[model samples]
Target: VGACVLCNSQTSLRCGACIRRPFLCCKCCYDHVISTSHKLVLSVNPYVCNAPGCDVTDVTQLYLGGMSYYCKSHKPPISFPLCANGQVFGLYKNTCVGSDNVTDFNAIATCDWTNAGDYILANTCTERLKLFAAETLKATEETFKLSYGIATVREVLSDRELHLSWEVGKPRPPLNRNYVFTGYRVTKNSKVQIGEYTFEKGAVVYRGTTTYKLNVGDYFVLTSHTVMPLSAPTLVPQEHYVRITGLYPTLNISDEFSSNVANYQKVGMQKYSTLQGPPGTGKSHFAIGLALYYPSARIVYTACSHAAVDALCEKALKYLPIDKCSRIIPAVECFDKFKVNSTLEQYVFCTVNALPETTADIVVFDEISMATNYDLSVVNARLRAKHYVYIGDPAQLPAPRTLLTKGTLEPEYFNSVCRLMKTIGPDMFLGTCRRCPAEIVDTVSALVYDNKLKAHKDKSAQCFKMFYKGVITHDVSSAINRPQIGVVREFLTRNPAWRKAVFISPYNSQNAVASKILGLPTQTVDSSQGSEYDYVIFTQTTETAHSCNVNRFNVAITRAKVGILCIMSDRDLYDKLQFTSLEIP
Candidate 1:
């Protein structure tokens, strides 16, 4: 006998119809046929039935490579065995279907060594597999609860103990002692993490051994080892995840009617439009006019701040029908100072988190630049309006920054509704400075608005003539700036005519010092965004240039309809003031 081609074994078996008819041993004959596309000799048929307790051998019932066979009377099982982790075995489709309810086949008749361990482990379904499956199921349920469940601090029983109301569609899972429980306090801007707590099952009260105090109106979220990087459920009071997914369509218009107020009203008629209002522009005026233009249509006016809403409501009542317009205040007790006519007290006002679920013809958002995209989407989804008019100045203060937590989107790209609307291009621009005098308008226009702003001639009489007609610049040396405070006190004493004066600063520390000494209405530049006064005295305490950025300077200078006084320690900022000033006497 010739030597075998694969091994030097002495046998008379040879490959059938293969090149050179290589000699193969009895074991090597099957190995050669499986390893290559060759066939075994017709005389040798070593396969038998693979079914249990059956040994019928037939070529018709044999699968490829004689790996599996079944007799005519024997039927295949409904499903083949799967790996412990649910991986299916590779087998011929005609032979069997896997546990995943899919037909699988080993086309090349090769062994799957990669999943051999899974196959062996699946056969016995060991204790390790049961433990792993339980853990996996528990983790899946925990993640579902964290995402959909609502957690709120119901009542503050004591400084260390509070009652929490957890709302979910399914039954609550039992708390495990081995699992660590962490709490977080939810706010408009951030979710601050409180320390871990001990959960009492009776009435679901949280008693903490830690020193963190819980209060009313504070919401809480829980996380544990099973669910991490917890995404706090949205406070938006809606079912869907609200976000601006695409650009608003642009309107086809020209710059020819840029100065006409009628052009702005026309732009507001579109489905979606944005109006760019500079510092002194009448943004609220345009909003009221648009509402009046669609008199029969239901309109809803909203703003980021309560003060802004109050101002808009007060101004809108002058021209709009008293019976049609309404104000929806979230906290009526807190807004007792909100002025309203007694006749419309009950009929035209509502105190709620949002407007009643109703359709609106037009929804006007004032100071929209300060609103986040999430804020817009919530209101938009609730109102279901046909038209949306966004009015704000992008150059002014933007939406307040928030902590970049797990569920929060990027601030620049997602937080700002102003930035998002600008992608569609501004449909109108209000270039006239009707609220400020020439000196204040000209200075701010050059400093921030590229000199495109024009001061109305009627406002010239409103300018103060005693000192620098519109603005005064004084440099201070000390942090307290006693000289600036004395100037304010002396100016108010000598001239009782300047009664409507307010003090503003970039830093709250300086505002505190000035407010105590001067005894006037005091606010930070950020809080003074939509405010206006006859005279404003700005105290800049920081030596760094950050205190005098364009947005801050624009808001500070544009607040005064009569005059403004700038006191600063930085010489570079002092020199940047191009307005007239009186000597610090």
Candidate 2:
């Protein structure tokens, strides 16, 4: 394992075969024949052969013969002409020395600058690069995002491509040390320094596609490997500041509501809260508070009912945040879901039925089960993300007669969702109704076949809320539908306060009855009138409200917030209709 690589003298000096004088007879003979490749003599000075007036074979043991430093001492420094094509390679800077300040005499060899090559003792120059590329990133899952402000994620995109949305930070320049990229660890205080480039508390710098733990000044290679700019899934630096301004309900959130809101540090909410009461309960007012984390996050407001949507919209207005006007769809045609501008940095109203894939920082869907199955696929398929929220009263019927089934609708739909809730264990729920009266709340807790009833709670009261008075009578008909003339008019007139009553007559000929005036002739009653009246008298035809289970009579009765006097032709038919009246909160 030991031999003189240069000038095959004693095995005392260089152990590896020297590249400078490989062609000489003595150099060729000793080339790998005596010494092992890694061996080298660190103590020997003047290790190159120097025989000025004659020939000498040894470059080490300089007992006599002029101390070697050249070719007269060592091959007169092998000068070869530099050329480009067939012509000479003219140095633009006229033989400008390399960054290492070492000149390349092997210029006669091929000149391929593609590898950042200018021949400056390449073997020794890249030792740092090797070391830097081997270390790992310092940030783990939690460290990347802190409580207060956040810097953009400093990712090394050298070999791996991360598609998830990551807030990125500033670039850290390279280290001035040799072998900056080769897993260079700072063993002590001597290696640490304020970062050469800008960064946050825990941010890092990628070096020569390598890495180093960022303290303050300690540098990485600052190579492309060190800084990954904010990608589409990445937030730009400016967004961070905007996030700070819109920061959610942290300990620092408005002290005004602090009493109502839970302390983030002392005790997190123990369980998921449910917004009690029925559909009209101001669950939204409470829901808005849940959105305290919205401003900084990629918050999505998706819901089944328009009322729920209105609540989210109201939050945007209250915070003076970004969002489009009410009753408007995104773009009118395409599915981009253009954001209604927000005063804060990040905010969006994304409808699950339609959304941009791989986009959304955080996606929320209200009334999760109510949305169409196709929309569910859209959400599940495009989930190239980290955060998601689903909101819905899953127990309610999303659409009539659409039961959890394997045929048209899979039963696993409900089962699977249940499993998902269990899997996403970190979710927080809403528990109290912040806006509706107790009576209205109680009533909503119980609803029937009807949808979106213009509810009223008073029998004779002036409120626009309502209570369901079950099927007072049941009537079935085919010959004449909604012949409300004598019956409906008599009923409401008797109640006095029951002016507007929505007649949820089953799906018979009554679609036309919506406008017909009760006392007028068949054609005299304008069925074309859509809720344009002092009273809505719904005449039930058992043939229409024929649901196998719950009573459609409950549906009809709930529509009228005032006294809903149901006009079913007879009791036998009423009993046949199998109805129930829900006088609700």
Candidate 3:
């Protein structure tokens, strides 16, 4: 008889859950369990060949030793097929026979073996599915993919819990509460699983509570032994799942368009009004409709940038008709709709050079947040557009540094339009964001609007992390940075509605490097003001132990309509920035 791994005493076989060896004699197994609390199964048949058919091999082998078991009888020892109702199902041919009444016995007349070299742990589950023929294993994988379409590990909170969420297929059953996950570490040559996994289910949403100090590149797998419900339970899609807002076929305001109608009436009455909201809320879009609402009412539009001016003019042309459009001044001639006596010095020198002699009905200042106090006051004090409509988020960045300096205003000046909100106030605020995903809307609200870095673990959103060593320099970040670029490339390759993303960094050096790596032009957060992209990757290289100034982060994060990739070097810094409470810290 072989000696026990620990005591070296000879006796009939018992199984130990240690990574070094799976087999042991009775005394050693008992001692191992008591000391470590690792479950050990006692067997009196140590002398008999433990190969399957007799179903003894599962007790003697671990995961990496081989691919499959044959003559496979008895239990697989793989504690999988965990269900929401707290059932653990394994196999008998194909049936998910409960562990209690399990029956499958086929002794191997012959067998083959697979070593660590045969399987790769860091590889994706799709690769694993290609190799295995076992029904239970395949079904477990298939079910996981169906349950959570894309499972991503969000953050490892300080309590040692891992935050995770995913896109689900159908409504999930309530009985599902916890998920037991196993992880593999990526090494230079291959992925190596840690000696212990020790995880559970009947588990529902993962809310960032874990037993280990999870590391980057620690790939995790999720699966459970679930018994089928007698009748499928009713399920509702998560609130953040993809939903398209219905655009009005025509720009005709109706009673149902409560907010629009209110603003439309406000335009008729108030000589001056302001529209205030966050970016995705369509403030500029509403301004366009407001301008078109008053036919023969000429509009003089101005914004900090040519892009902003062009965007508003485009909307006006697209929605307003030929005779009505002829009245709308194109962006180039910003002062064309002003009064005949208005002087060249009356308007800002940057965008509008020439003035038209038609007294305007309304003056629209879009993205008014980027306008300094001096610039907006020019319009307020002078010129004669009967009505003035100013639109933008007061929370966004103010005028550009150069412009702010030239005007000699506070570097952190708030918009003048926002001050208007105090007396006349905003008649309308478009609440729903039509551009960003639902999760982004929630995230912007919690972090930007409310100034709290909070998380709802049960919410459905895809967030992941990529950790790199060497403090995220140009050379160091490239290690993980290159791979992430590939990921975004694949996304664009697959989705036709998408485009290449923008990379925003706090440092100019990183911007140059990242621009080349991502093959996209890069900009600082300040430069990205009044602009947006469908996808954005932001890297913050500045080192800080305190909180990230998310006030500065607002402009860049809001740029992306669909997705955001946060590339960070200092874990502690990001944690402080992202995990700190509502103090705007």
Candidate 4:
């Protein structure tokens, strides 16, 4: 390459008709082309067109009316628009001077008061104004309006037709961004799109005549997407909604036994322990504490009655998250939040014919004394708990005869519970009686545990206390004992607040009769397990006072939080207050 002949810049082009060996300087080559018809041939690499920033190596200036040129991309842009839409668009950028204050115009454009169709340049003003026409500006304004306004999900109705109604209002046409109900899609449960059903234009309504019924767990999440017969699965922010529930196991933990159980920060008696307390002395408390202390341990909690089992499961669910724990009631009646089948067999094993899904780490058998031999065997066969605790008032009545003889004649308390007790040795005593009055506690403890039968300790004792140390010589059915029942009714009617009180008897028939007469909850001693009240009324219907079980009497007296009232024939309990040869508690 030779240096330029005119300006001494590096030269690459030479005239095709010229006989020169060296290439001409770029300016002289252009001057030569202007004077003749000769074209220019380029020299190899490095040298370029003299126009600034151009990379072309071979170029001859044409005989134009004015200046030289090179690549067209580097050419100057055409001037700003001369039309009204172009002028306003230019003002949108604060470049044109039609509006007085550019800041005010910009502020109005973004504010709520300004209609989207009004004059204001968009941010892409330069490109938009260059192509500005009346139709173009209207299209841009509509696009801006569509982007600015929020499309609303207005009403959701499920009564006559399962429908979701939404509206964005009418607007000018020829816009792709309009609120188009391309169709509605249904999402089952939380996810998984079932299908999409399309709708025609006008007021949005689900026109499909398919009347489908929704099942129990079937949660229909109606979603409005941008496509019908959607080609791709697209999720929308149409507000995820589902049926609300829970605040599960709302019972709070009592501190009495909670403190004792919390003491087991680590495993203490890993295999077996028994919680023996008077009725309402916090055997349930101890159970709650144990559950909370070992939240990670899977638990299998069981009980004798439906209520007892419900209480255990309720407390367990309260103590731990439902995912970490479960409730199993051995009945077809529904549980609060059961995950297994509703049968004694299924609940015992946690599921049908499978091992207890919770082959529990900690097993709580509430009202253990009331669990018959069969109930115990059901647990004994299936339970593989690493640590187990039995919570009961052993002083309560033993399992009723039905539970005893259901599958066997006499797997009696000895072979059933006593044997289980022997394996764990003596019970860990919960000696407090805070739930009952001091007098009530003294009577129950002495009569049940010490076999020292005496009158209840209440100076104002006739209406509030009863010491039936003897037996009723007659059959103590409900109607036969009207005088006794009437006396108790008068006491409760006067007290008014004793409406919360409960009555207990040895037989279910007697309780049924008492419940009818008194209109208060009355239960057999066996059924009264895991329950307590403001006052207790004991009415024993045994063959004789001597024949009465101390455990049943104990359960009756201790059910009171305040006082105890007794209604038995004076003849039945009017006996010597001494331990008989029966070898009682």
Candidate 5:
């Protein structure tokens, strides 16, 4: 007997419906039923032997069986037969029988106790045998009939309720056959499971309420599950799973080939290419140029964030025709906010939880450094593209905290897709800085890029110059630095000409304090990776070198196109900044 779940009194009663099966006394059982409305069941003594005339009640010597409980001495010996497919070993009959021909008294045994330690019967074993039986039954059923359908959203009854219909294909089933339908709300980034509904024998239409509100541009996929009498339901292939909307039309191969047949010689063709470069190296520009090079080729442009994809879409629209290009976003809100033209709204956009069902000639993924290994595997498996182009700077941030970074996996798994692609030795490295001035570019290149990067001639002649100012060594009073916040506010207030200035810090705590006190949002170097500004005011709040690495420093310094202000507590860090023009106050 176990202690009562509510009163601590010893009892043998348990709540039947609850997963934990909490024990309850007679009085507490009534109270539990009144509160939770859960049914009660007798807590059977599992230690007792079930063999006829056996009276052993030892828990340590008990061995669980498929049909009943038994002590080690009273446990029945099971036999195994070399049964072929569609058959299982029946314990009591001591022979193999058809999986569908077993009765309640004839217990199905997975294995015998000849090798007890190596193989044994338990709840886990029962589950395994059940799955095996189901697969065998499914194989025989597959030869008889297959179910396929295209499901569509009929009407949006309300935020929670939706009306859906399906068009079944192929040999229809006989009467009294039931099919289970499961739906998932699809977005560009992820899929959310809504609910599963069992349709009444051969019914196609269903009206149900979802756990989440249905919105415009939210697509759904429905898969059919055929119920089996002896085993669990079997799911059909993903190709049969249907989505009514967001389906792209098949491209005209003849028209595409005739138009781009002559221009193929200009752009060198490769199966896979990696473009490695620092920030502002026109990676997106190269992606657009490659797409335009093959005007008739279908292309899919993707990135880790909506902002990055939105930027690429904006740039590509300038040269490509609206009808030839389409942007896949996560929701209707994204389309409304990032759309370029009203006329191109309906035809030039779509939403997807994964890659589109259609194939493409080329698939370009920018910011490859931020993509995980799993992300690459998904894209590789889903998209049937002839050519793939990956663009990113490995010196920037890697994918966010993952199992690879947590020491559970090898360090090589943590390497970005760009770094992995570099192993093939087919990568092109762009080292010119067109955005930052010569002073800022040269300092960053020396510190981070091993002095391989150079500024453009026009950027070298620009008026703005990088400046370094020294501050007194102040102890970090707390995570929030009052002195650093004061310096930022005073600098921005005095220099109104630096209109588009941003406060950047290596630490989130310092950025939070600066943002709150200065009445402007401050960004950490990690968050400001894909962003740029006219001027950058970087604050180093702590003297510890924990967050002051070369990679983060490179991202922070290179964010400004015009100039950057470096304010730091460590005087030795300024020594490393000897390349920049220094000014002490």
Candidate 6:
């Protein structure tokens, strides 16, 4: 039997460390560990192994051993559920969850045998890395590449119920919602598509009991998830998902918009737009198009990672022919299609968050899905311009607290809530493709979409000029190539021309790998670093791993102008690949 680890003596099977302390039975010894009481438990079963909502956030909020407190985000301090896994996996770290399903069947697993070393908990789903196997893993990967990119992930930290104690050691929770992360900040959007349809994914309607005088194109910004359209299913009635405007290619000047964008340039305090679609599309181009189209307007492009901002600004400077060398003039420059808001911080790019009100006419923020609601609020507070366009996938939200709230809030609602204050308004779209391979697009869309996304499917098989034959690795276990100076050593003999390309990744960290991988000079790049690359090799994706497998992967893959080789370990992730191995051996 599993005896009391703290009270047992040496020589017996479950007695050696039984009385030593931390290694003893988690239940009996630690029963009164955190709280001065008996076994801790909740009233509801919050185990969500493979459920509708992601992140064991909800699970941690309502179960036993979960920390319950109220921060500014959650009013009155909501409950955090514990998981069936003994360790309380939360969006944040340092919490205990219900361990009602742990088993000793396999018995001698590597991670488990050594007394559960360097792992989250008893259950063995820890992350592992194997570089030599980069071959099989290279089979499943995204197809696009750019100098910069981003992704979003969501999570839940609290709940409404309380259930403690399980039959066994953290019994597996129901698989109603398959979550990516546990405890702490999370990414909700499954996959983040950057190319074309990065703007138009699923949206959560936040309008309440009464209908506002919102026209078809009228911008709807909701700062609080409580007031968002996505929360309608539970928060309010007669409110659900609604298409603010259609970017579906065919219709223009559609009466759907609240007002004509041209005549009513002053009609809105802020204007927001969405561009939704799969890989190979041109979402970045569209965002850059807006920046170039309104070159005279002060613009800011933000994303989850510094890389994304770099990519957007870099592309605009390159394609629109507006390099860092371009000067910034006043109203007199209105006639000239070249105006920019430069900055020191790379993440903010030309349009840093601290944009001088005097300089901001149009602020474009990207990857809203990966930012926290708090960051969203901060962003909303900074925009001084009446023109704003949020380019990102709402399906991707940075929510380490709740489920739909994360996905629905960032890319989609950050704009929605801003509309509430009249800073962010209106909706427009650009959803199509001209960049990704048919194979990549087909598989991604097929997995995520129920039917609506089917409209944008590829006509037939695709044949790109240069493609590395491999397999797809969406939702699988594989080793992703981490771009480092040493890592890029393999590509030295192949492309000598990369020397001219700007080292966008950086010199110390992301750049160390990217620059070396591309075999280029050691100088880092700035907002003015565009136009140097006839072909750029980008590495060091981003840290907002809230949505690692989906959106982030999407962002990294779509940032290349010439050749791109993504280094990953997750095989069952993206779609099947056409290549065999990324091995140097």
The digit string of per-residue lDDT tens for model 4 on 136-180 reads: 222333344344232222444443233333234643221111122
Candidate 1: misplaced stretches above 4 Å? 1-261, 330-353, 402-416, 420-425, 457-500, 571-573, 581-585
TM-score of each: 0.49, 0.37, 0.43, 0.45, 0.51, 0.33
Kindly list the per-residue Cα lDDT of model 1 for residues 84-178, writing each as its tens digit: 12211122212221222111111112222123232222112322222222223234435444653545678876654567776767444333222
Q: How many residue pairs collide in each prediction?
A: 3, 71, 23, 7, 1, 146
Reference-based TM-score, model 5: 0.51
Tens digits of per-residue lDDT, candidate 3, 1-585, equal: 344433334544444332223333443443333334344343333222235445333222222113232222332556221112221111221222122210110000001112211111111122112112122222333454345343334655444344545446643222111233445666898866442232212111232323455554564554344421111111111122122111112345544343576565665555556676675676666776664455445566667566676566556555555333332232323423322232232122122212243345666777776664334434543446556667777656664331111122221224335544434545556666666655555656665555322222222233322333224334321212344344444544664333467777655445555555557777667667667787676666544321144545566666766666665555653443322121110
RMSD list, candidates in order: 21.5, 28.8, 28.3, 35.2, 19.7, 22.5
Best TM-score among the predictions, by candidate number: 5
Q: Which 10-residue window of candidate 4 scores lowest in summed lDDT?
A: 228-237
TM-score of 2: 0.37
Q: For model 6, how does the per-residue alpha-carbon lDDT over 447-560 read when each residue is reduced to its tens digit? A: 433222322333323211122222222212111235333344544346554455444331123443344355464322222121222233433333223324343344433333
Which candidate number maximizes lDDT?
1
- Candidate 5 per-residue C-alpha lDDT over 480-528 given as tens digits, one digit per residue, 9 for 90 to 100: 4567667666666777665467888766556656666775657778779
Better of 3 and 6 by lDDT: 3
Model 4: residues with Cα > 4 Å off, grouped in runs: 1-258, 261-267, 329-331, 338-358, 402-415, 419-427, 450-463, 466-479, 489-500, 512-517, 541-547, 570-585
Mark the regions of model 6 whose C-alpha exceeds 4 Å error after superposition: 1-271, 277-280, 291-352, 358-361, 394-429, 448-548, 553-585
Q: Give the TM-score of candidate 6.
A: 0.33
